[PDB]
Chains A and B, each alone.
Chain A
Amino acid sequence: NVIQDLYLRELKDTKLAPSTLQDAEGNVKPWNPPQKPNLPELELQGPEALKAYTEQNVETAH
């Protein structure tokens, strides 16, 4: 009755309100994927180090 009147009239005669899709985009992030952060490298390259370490390291006692 009043139920019908309210239902019909309201639903039909008022269809939505404006909204901004752009603003929605603003509050969220699309995110582009990180690419190659750092590449591994040759560990302690230079056999200057190797000879040095062999010769220097000898912490055994007399």
Chain B
Amino acid sequence: VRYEASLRQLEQRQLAKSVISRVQSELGNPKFQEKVLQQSISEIEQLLSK
């Protein structure tokens, strides 16, 4: 049980660093531009609801 649990944690941190790699992948894109448009309209929706 102890080594099994340790392995679940080890797997989780390995796959965690892959999430970091996916973050680096997202931030390159001109999705960096295109989602700003999404944020722009989202803030329009938010502040109009105020």
Contact = CB atoms under 8 A, between A and B. Distances in A.
Asked if A and B form a direct contact in the complex, defined as CB atoms under 8 angstroms apart, the reply is yes
A8 B46 CA distance: 25
A28 B3 contact: yes
Given A1-B42, A5-B35, A9-B26, A24 B15 contact: no
Interface in B2-24: 2-4, 7, 10-11, 14-15, 18-19, 21-23
Contacts of A10: 18-19, 22
Contacts of A13: 22
Interface residues of A, number: 14
A24 B5 CA distance: 11
A10 B17 CA distance: 11
Interface of B: 2-4, 7, 10-11, 14-15, 18-19, 21-23, 25-26, 31, 35, 38-39, 42
The 6 closest A-B CB pairs, nearest first, are A10-B22, A14-B18, A17-B14, A27-B3, A10-B19, A28-B3
